[PDB]
Short mmCIF file of C-alpha atoms and ligand atoms in Angstrom, two decimals:
data_model
loop_
_atom_site.label_atom_id
_atom_site.label_comp_id
_atom_site.label_asym_id
_atom_site.label_seq_id
_atom_site.Cartn_x
_atom_site.Cartn_y
_atom_site.Cartn_z
CA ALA B 1 94.15 87.03 73.37
CA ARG B 2 92.83 85.25 76.41
CA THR B 3 90.18 88.00 78.34
CA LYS B 4 88.18 87.79 81.57
CA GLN B 5 85.56 89.68 83.32
CA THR B 6 85.23 88.96 87.01
CA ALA B 7 82.37 91.05 88.04
CA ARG B 8 80.08 91.08 84.98
CA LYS B 9 76.83 92.78 84.56
CA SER B 10 74.19 90.26 83.71
CA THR B 11 70.92 90.81 82.22
CA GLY B 12 69.27 87.84 84.03
CA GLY I 1 93.43 85.15 91.90
CA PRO I 2 96.50 84.72 94.23
CA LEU I 3 98.25 82.60 91.24
CA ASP I 4 97.53 85.23 88.59
CA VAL I 5 99.78 88.31 88.42
CA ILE I 6 98.26 91.75 87.90
CA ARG I 7 101.14 94.33 86.06
CA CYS I 8 98.97 97.17 84.26
CA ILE I 9 100.18 100.62 83.13
CA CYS I 10 98.11 102.17 85.66
CA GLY I 11 100.32 100.21 88.57
CA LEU I 12 96.86 99.71 90.34
CA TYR I 13 96.63 96.12 91.32
CA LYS I 14 92.85 95.43 91.19
CA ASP I 15 90.86 93.10 89.25
CA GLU I 16 88.23 95.19 87.45
CA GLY I 17 86.84 95.69 84.27
CA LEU I 18 87.34 93.67 81.36
CA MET I 19 91.30 92.68 81.51
CA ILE I 20 93.40 90.77 78.91
CA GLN I 21 96.81 88.51 79.30
CA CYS I 22 99.72 89.18 77.63
CA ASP I 23 100.58 85.93 75.55
CA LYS I 24 104.27 85.79 76.66
CA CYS I 25 104.61 86.85 80.39
CA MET I 26 101.20 86.20 81.30
CA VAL I 27 100.72 89.00 83.52
CA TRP I 28 97.08 90.53 83.17
CA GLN I 29 96.26 94.30 82.44
CA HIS I 30 92.91 96.40 81.76
CA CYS I 31 91.77 96.73 78.29
CA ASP I 32 90.62 100.28 79.28
CA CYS I 33 94.31 101.39 80.23
CA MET I 34 95.92 99.34 77.46
CA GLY I 35 93.79 100.75 75.00
CA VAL I 36 92.34 97.52 73.54
CA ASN I 37 89.56 94.90 73.94
CA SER I 38 87.96 91.22 73.49
CA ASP I 39 88.40 91.24 69.76
CA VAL I 40 92.10 91.69 69.46
CA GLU I 41 93.59 87.92 67.94
CA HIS I 42 96.89 88.31 69.94
CA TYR I 43 98.17 90.59 73.14
CA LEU I 44 101.39 91.70 74.61
CA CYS I 45 102.05 93.78 77.37
CA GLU I 46 103.73 97.42 76.68
CA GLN I 47 106.84 95.68 78.42
CA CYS I 48 107.17 92.69 75.92
CA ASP I 49 106.43 95.31 73.22
CA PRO I 50 107.53 98.70 73.94
CA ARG I 51 104.94 101.37 72.77
CA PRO I 52 103.23 104.35 73.34
CA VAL I 53 100.08 103.78 75.27
CA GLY R 1 115.01 89.02 80.87
CA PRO R 2 111.35 89.10 79.07
CA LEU R 3 109.98 86.36 80.28
CA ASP R 4 110.73 87.23 84.18
CA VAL R 5 108.01 89.63 85.22
CA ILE R 6 109.13 92.65 87.66
CA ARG R 7 106.59 93.98 89.78
CA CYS R 8 107.47 95.77 92.66
CA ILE R 9 106.14 97.99 95.30
CA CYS R 10 107.84 100.53 93.32
CA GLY R 11 106.18 100.23 90.19
CA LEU R 12 109.40 100.73 88.21
CA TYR R 13 110.00 98.04 85.91
CA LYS R 14 113.53 98.22 86.38
CA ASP R 15 116.38 95.79 86.91
CA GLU R 16 118.51 96.92 89.36
CA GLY R 17 120.36 96.00 92.70
CA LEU R 18 119.53 92.97 94.23
CA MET R 19 116.43 91.36 93.49
CA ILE R 20 114.01 88.74 94.96
CA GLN R 21 111.51 86.53 93.24
CA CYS R 22 108.29 85.47 95.12
CA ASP R 23 107.91 81.92 96.01
CA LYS R 24 104.35 81.43 94.60
CA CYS R 25 103.15 84.39 91.92
CA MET R 26 106.94 84.50 90.46
CA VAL R 27 107.10 88.07 90.37
CA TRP R 28 110.63 89.94 91.39
CA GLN R 29 110.79 92.97 93.34
CA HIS R 30 113.79 94.77 94.78
CA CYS R 31 115.08 93.57 97.82
CA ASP R 32 115.48 97.17 99.34
CA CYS R 33 112.40 98.14 98.39
CA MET R 34 110.55 95.63 99.96
CA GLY R 35 112.99 95.30 103.28
CA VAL R 36 114.96 91.97 102.60
CA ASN R 37 118.05 90.84 101.58
CA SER R 38 119.28 86.82 100.25
CA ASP R 39 119.32 85.81 103.70
CA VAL R 40 115.57 85.11 103.94
CA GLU R 41 114.73 81.51 103.43
CA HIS R 42 111.48 81.85 101.85
CA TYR R 43 109.87 85.01 100.25
CA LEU R 44 106.24 86.15 99.06
CA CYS R 45 105.74 89.59 97.96
CA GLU R 46 103.17 91.78 99.35
CA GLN R 47 99.85 90.74 97.20
CA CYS R 48 100.44 86.84 98.20
CA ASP R 49 101.39 87.88 101.49
CA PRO R 50 99.74 91.45 102.45
CA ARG R 51 101.38 93.33 104.85
CA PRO R 52 102.96 97.11 105.65
CA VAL R 53 106.09 97.70 103.84
CA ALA H 1 114.63 82.43 98.09
CA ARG H 2 115.66 82.95 94.72
CA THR H 3 117.56 86.20 94.11
CA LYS H 4 119.52 87.63 91.44
CA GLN H 5 121.88 90.85 90.57
CA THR H 6 122.30 91.26 87.03
CA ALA H 7 124.81 94.31 86.88
CA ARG H 8 127.00 93.31 89.92
CA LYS H 9 130.17 95.23 90.92
CA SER H 10 133.39 92.92 91.08
CA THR H 11 136.78 93.11 92.47
CA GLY H 12 138.44 91.51 89.74
ZN1 ZN L 1 95.15 99.34 84.25
ZN1 ZN L 2 104.34 90.85 78.54
ZN1 ZN L 3 111.15 98.34 93.79
ZN1 ZN L 4 102.99 86.81 94.64
#
C-alpha cells in the first residue's frame, strides 16, 4: 500500500 | 500537500506520522488512528470498507 | 458514491442536501455547512482556501 | 461550481 511520513526522524 | 486529501477517522486535517492512502478513493489516513502500518499489501479506508476501527 | 469523497467541516460522512465540490481537491461539502449555494461560479474548500466558516 | 442533490424533493 502507499504510505508516507513527511517529517521523519533521521539518525544522520 | 494541497492536492492530497486527508480524511482520517480522527477528523483532524493534519499531516502527522506514518500515513496510508486508500487504494480506491485516494484519501490519506493516519496509520495509528486506523490500526495499520506500512506492512499491509493493500489498504481501503473505513468508508470504502466499513468496519469497526 | 464510493469514488466520491465527502469531506465537510461538519465531519459527517453523509450525502445530504445540496452539496458542492471543491474545484481543486474534488471533495464534496454540504452547502449549508459552508455557507454557499449553487449560485457561486467557483468553489474551494476550507483547506484549499482557509477562512472562517 | 459543481453541485448535486441526490434525494431532491420533486413536485411530480
Ligand atoms: Zn487520524
Ligand atoms: Zn476509500
Ligand atoms: Zn457538512
Ligand atoms: Zn479543496
